[PDB]
A paper describes a structure:
Glutaminyl-peptide cyclotransferases (QCs) convert the N-terminal glutamine or glutamate residues of protein and peptide substrates into pyroglutamate (pE) by releasing ammonia or a water molecule. The N-terminal pE modification protects peptides/proteins against proteolytic degradation by amino- or exopeptidases, increasing their stability. Indeed, its crystal structure revealed that a Zn(II) ion bound in a tetrahedral coordination to Asp159, Glu202, His330, and to a water molecule. All X-ray crystallography experiments were performed using the hQC double mutant Y115E-Y117E (hQC-2X), formerly validated by us as a soluble protein variant exploitable for drug discovery purposes.
The crystal structure of apo-hQC-2X was determined to be 1.96 Å resolution, in the monoclinic space group C2. The crystal asymmetric unit (ASU) contains three independent molecules that are almost identical within experimental errors (pairwise root-mean-square deviation, RMSD, values of 0.11–0.14 Å). The tertiary structure of hQC-2X, having the mixed α/β hydrolase fold with an open sandwich topology, is not affected by the removal of the functional metal cofactor. Indeed, the structural comparison between apo-hQC-2X and the holo-enzyme shows no meaningful difference, as indicated by RMDS values ranging from 0.21 Å to 0.24 Å. This evidence suggests that the binding of the metal cofactor, although critical for the catalytic function, is not necessary for the enzyme to acquire the proper folding. Upon removal of the metal ion, a water molecule, WatC, populates the cofactor binding pocket in all three subunits composing the ASU. WatC donates two H-bonds to Asp159 and Glu202 and receives from His330 and a further water molecule (Wat2), placed inside the catalytic cavity and bound to Trp329. On the opposite wall, the indole moiety of Trp207 is rotated inside the catalytic cavity, contributing to the cone-shaped active site. The crystal structure of apo-hQC underlines the robustness of the hQC active site cavity that maintains its structure even without the metal ion. On the other hand, this scarcely flexible cavity indicates quite strict requirements for molecules that can be hosted as either substrates or inhibitors.
Numbering used by the authors: 34 to 148, 152 to 183, 189 to 361
């Protein structure tokens, strides 16, 4: 039937001032930092001990929550410039059999560099922490989903980074795999025509977050009305005095276009028709692909602000 089009007419349920205050109070940037971010600041390129530890960390942090998250590990083999490697996407789903999910994603691998070590704080340890912080902060509300046909999913992609220099064949290992897999998988089971890709309302991909004064442009016409929601949320939170070290002149969400094409985990989803809201700034952080992409260079207030915005957005999307 026509359920794959419901995404196109889906509206937010907009939060009042007293609700926005409650969400602002319910996230803890220091707990994220201590409990979510710090354990991820390790070398975690595919097959390294760090990759296994990051993966166990993300799963433990998720399982400890009340909401009925279902984890799945999507593990596969691929040739690389270094020889064959194993890769493990982490998918964490509420209500797997619901036709529709809002999808938040990042990558949890770190790009390999020869020796100081590269731990890619903004790239993408912070995105990971933010997702885990969202799950934690919204737990009580997300628990209410264990009872339209729409829920939430988190994807932590492996193998986003090139091993050598970026090419079509050396990058996006995990996202190219999972997109192809979802494209061939009936959803709901027993349905004709419709895939798991049909079920993805919107893919919200966080990447390179945590540098000061980020500017996210409005990359895609087909997510522009959700981008406008992010601008609105930032604007109301500011006016309500719920953001820190934030100016309307220095706002994160700015309605301008972007000139090129960014390659990232959304690419295999976008080319098959999935709507993408790509929360990657332009320019990239100053420390991009640098040993200085580290904890010290992160802006805690900025990240805390983005947490508030993203959490409101997600509640508003899911009607919670």
């Amino acid at each position: 039937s026509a359920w794959p089009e419901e995404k196109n007419y889906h509206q937010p349920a907009i939060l009042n001032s007293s609700a926005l205050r409650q969400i602002a109070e319910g996230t803890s940037i220091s707990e994220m930092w201590q409990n979510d971010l710090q354990p991820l600041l390790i070398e975690r390129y595919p097959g390294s001990p760090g990759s296994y530890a990051a993966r166990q960390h993300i799963m433990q942090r998720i399982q400890r929550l009340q909401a009925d998250w279902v984890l799945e590990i999507d593990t596969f083999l691929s040739q690389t410039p270094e020889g064959e490697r194993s890769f493990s996407n982490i998918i964490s789903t509420l209500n797997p059999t619901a036709k529709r999910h809002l999808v938040l994603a990042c990558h949890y691998d770190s790009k390999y560099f020869s020796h100081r070590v590269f731990v890619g704080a903004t790239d993408s340890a912070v995105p990971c922490a933010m997702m885990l912080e969202l799950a934690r902060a919204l737990d009580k509300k997300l628990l209410s989903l264990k009872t339209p046909d729409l829920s939430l999913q988190l994807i932590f992609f492996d193998g986003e980074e090139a091993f050598l220099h970026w090419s079509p064949q050396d990058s996006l290992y995990g996202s190219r795999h999972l997109a192809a897999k979802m494209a061939s998988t009936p959803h709901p089971p027993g349905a004709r025509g419709t895939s798991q890709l049909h079920g993805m309302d919107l893919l919200v991909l966080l990447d390179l977050i945590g540098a000061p004064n980020p500017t996210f442009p409005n990359f895609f016409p087909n997510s522009a009305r959700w981008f406008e929601r992010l601008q609105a949320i930032e604007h109301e939170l500011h006016e309500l005095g719920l953001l820190k070290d934030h100016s309307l002149e220095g706002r994160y969400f700015q309605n301008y276009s972007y000139g090129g094409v960014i390659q990232d985990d959304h690419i295999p989803f976008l080319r098959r028709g999935v709507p993408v809201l790509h929360l990657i700034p332009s320019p990239f952080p100053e420390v991009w692909h640098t040993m200085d992409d580290n904890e010290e260079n992160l802006d805690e207030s900025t990240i805390d602000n983005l947490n508030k915005i993203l959490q409101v957005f997600v509640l508003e999307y899911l009607h919670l």
